[PDB]
Amino acid sequence: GVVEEAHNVKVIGSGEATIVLGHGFGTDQSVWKHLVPHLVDDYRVVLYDNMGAGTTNPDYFDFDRYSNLEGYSFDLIAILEDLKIESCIFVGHSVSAMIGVLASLNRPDLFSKIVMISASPRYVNDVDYQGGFEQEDLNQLFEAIRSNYKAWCLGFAPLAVGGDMDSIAVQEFSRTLFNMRPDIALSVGQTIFQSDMRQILPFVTVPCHILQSVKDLVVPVVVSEYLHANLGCESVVEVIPSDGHLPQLSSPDSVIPVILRHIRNDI
């Protein structure tokens, strides 16, 4: 199918109990490789790639459609409808956490639970909010992306992933980062890092599990507290004693058991 092909959709298993996993900026569905083996015996598992990922056709990247996160949330609903999924647990990594939240505002019936990994509603600081970045910091990042994309990827990947700078996870993320077309990477980076989801958090009704590494380049721990305090749904927080923004990929031994506990157990 058109939607299936465009987003590299994979469906593993049959039956009603369904988990849908959405990845973050700069990576793809492979980020879930250490989690999926522990899900497939109990759940139908759905994987997909975000439009603009290097694994997707750049001719399908509509800059107007994806000028806000709503475009990605419409894609997610389209995938669920195409697969005739009536209800899922949604696991959202990084920007996909907010994409799932947005989708759940429009179609709360399609989600029983959202499990967030490394989520943030706002990366920019103001005098009463810590997101991790001053606007000048972000301006510097965008200029680096524009100036030399390969050099930026090589420098950013070890910082974002954490741990040893020459780990396989760092190498993998460097590769998927550079797999993006540079103009798309810049545009999507700006859209995500300048986003603001804070104001819609009180309207969320689907219960949320808020998970993150205690050390995360782009998500201060106080952001998990902020999500918990301001989401209008039932929520729980668990900060993991792990390093990195893609901890399910780079630190699975400590991270996967926590994610599984929150998938398998309700608040």
Residue numbers in the entry: 2 to 268
Give sentences from the paper.
Crystallographic studies and biochemical analyses have demonstrated the role of KAI2 as a KAR receptor. The structure of KAI2 displayed a canonical compact α/β-hydrolase domain that contained an α/β ‘core’ domain and a ‘lid’ domain. A smoke-derived compound, karrikin (KAR), and an endogenous but as yet unidentified KARRIKIN INSENSITIVE2 (KAI2) ligand (KL) have been identified as chemical cues in higher plants that impact on multiple aspects of growth and development.
However, in detail, we found that the residue A219 of KAI2 was bound to aromatic residues as Y124 and F134 of the lid domain by hydrophobic interactions, while the residue V219 of KAI2ply2 was bound to extended aromatic residues as Y124, F134, F157, F194, and H246 of the lid domain. Thus, the mutation Ala219Val caused stronger hydrophobic interactions with more residues. The entrance of KAI2 presents an opened pocket and hydrophobic charge for the ligand, whereas the entrance of KAI2ply2 forms a closed pocket due to C-gamma 1 and C-gamma 2 of V219, which is a bulkier residue than alanine. Thus, the narrowed entrance gate might contribute to the reduced ligand-binding ability of KAI2ply2. Furthermore, when we performed superimposition with the KAR1-bound KAI2 model previously reported by Guo et al. (2013), the V219 was predicted to cause a steric clash with the bound KAR. The results showed that the amino acid residues of KAI2 ranging from 125–150 exhibited a higher B-factor than those of KAI2ply2, implying that this region, corresponding to the helical ‘lid’ domain, might be more rigid with lower motional amplitude in the KAI2ply2 protein. The results suggested that KAI2ply2 was more thermally stable than the wild-type KAI2 protein, presumably due to increased hydrophobic interactions and reduced flexibility. Taken together, these results suggested that the Ala219Val substitution mutation of KAI2 not only impaired ligand-binding but also reduced the conformational flexibility of the lid domain, both of which would be critical for ligand perception and downstream signaling.
